[PDB]
Design a protein around this ligand. Structure first.
Ligand SMILES: [Ca+2]
Ligand SMILES: [Ca+2]
Lengths: 156, 166
């Protein structure tokens, strides 16, 4: 088998202290198989023991609060880098109420915790999009980056 | 020209019961698409009220009178989370569909974003202004402006009003 690897990067701005939190946790799986891996703190993933496939595989990237991404035609005739640190796979945050669509329901969930601060009764880390310690308009604007998007809106 | 956000009052003096109108506006904010501000005042001297009707501001009251971000085609979303008893106003507004807005190739960069009425409760010198708060880390003196790419805007001036003497 071979190794299928790459890097993933969420589509929003964040500082150095939170980088390890926002780049980890993306599950990458080869559709139709039991092969998969989850990105580490550097946004890096590596699937091993992958059988060759001249007819590229289809990969699916998922993570709570993010919009599922499907990438087809990933040819594997040896060890292959799906992406690189220099040119990582982007993932869009905002699919909070899971339904494969960034819409008003998602924004409403963040609004429910508007102005909540770390340690407060109404603070939920997952809703603190950029993880800076407070839930506010800055987080909502990030979700707005891809308002209206569904999985098919990702570059094919 | 100069990029800024400012709070200004129509009048500097008044009688008990008179409603002073504070106009918040932005000037030359490149690719402007949204905002959030935190404004504080002394609740025992002034009372936040609708500049038009004259209805008292509550925690969910969003200020009227804006001349920008009114195009329904981009789904403007307004949010209010004030605390009148503590003399705090905190509200935000932004287009949800900023991608569609950017597609027009022309941004709304100058205009009014809020009109707030302040009823005079006492004949005393008082001040109101933008002020940082724990719920807005990294803000510019209690203000955060965003562009149509969903990023925070920096480098603009925050012009404080007041010096309301009576
Ligand atoms: Ca959703
Ligand atoms: Ca945040």
């Amino acid at each position: 088998g071979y190794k299928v690897s790459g890097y993933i990067l969420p589509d929003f701005s964040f500082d150095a202290t939170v980088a390890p939190l926002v780049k980890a946790g993306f599950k990458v799986e080869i559709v139709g198989t039991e092969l998969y891996a989850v990105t580490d703190a550097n946004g890096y993933f590596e699937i091993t023991g992958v059988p060759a496939n001249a007819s590229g595989y289809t990969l699916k990237i998922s993570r709570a609060t993010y919009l599922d991404r499907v990438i087809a035609n990933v040819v594997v005739t040896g060890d292959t880098s799906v992406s690189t640190s220099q040119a990582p796979i982007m993932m869009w945050v905002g699919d909070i109420v899971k339904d494969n669509s960034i819409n008003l329901l998602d924004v409403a969930e963040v609004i429910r915790c508007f102005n909540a601060t770390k340690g407060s009764a109404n603070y939920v880390e997952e809703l603190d999009i950029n993880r800076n310690g407070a839930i506010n308009m800055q987080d909502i604007m990030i979700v707005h980056k891809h308002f209206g998007a569904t999985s098919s809106d990702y570059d094919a | 020209k100069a990029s800024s956000i400012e709070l200004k009052f129509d009048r500097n003096k008044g009688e008990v019961g008179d409603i002073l109108i504070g106009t918040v506006r932005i000037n030359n904010i490149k690719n402007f698409a949204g905002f959030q501000v935190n404004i504080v005042y002394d609740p025992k001297v002034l009372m936040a009220v609708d500049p038009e009707t004259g209805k008292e501001f509550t925690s969910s009251t969003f200020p009227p009178g804006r001349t920008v971000l009114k195009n329904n085609a981009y789904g403007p979303i307004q949010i209010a989370d004030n605390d009148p008893e503590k003399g705090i106003l905190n509200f935000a507004l932004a287009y949800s569909y900023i991608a569609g807005y950017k597609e027009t190739g022309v941004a709304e960069e100058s205009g009014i974003i809020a009109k707030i009425g302040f009823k005079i409760l006492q004949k005393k010198s008082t001040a109101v202004k933008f002020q940082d708060t724990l719920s807005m880390p990294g803000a510019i003196s209690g203000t955060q402006l965003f562009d149509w790419d969903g990023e925070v805007i920096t480098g603009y001036e925050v012009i404080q009003p007041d010096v309301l003497s009576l």
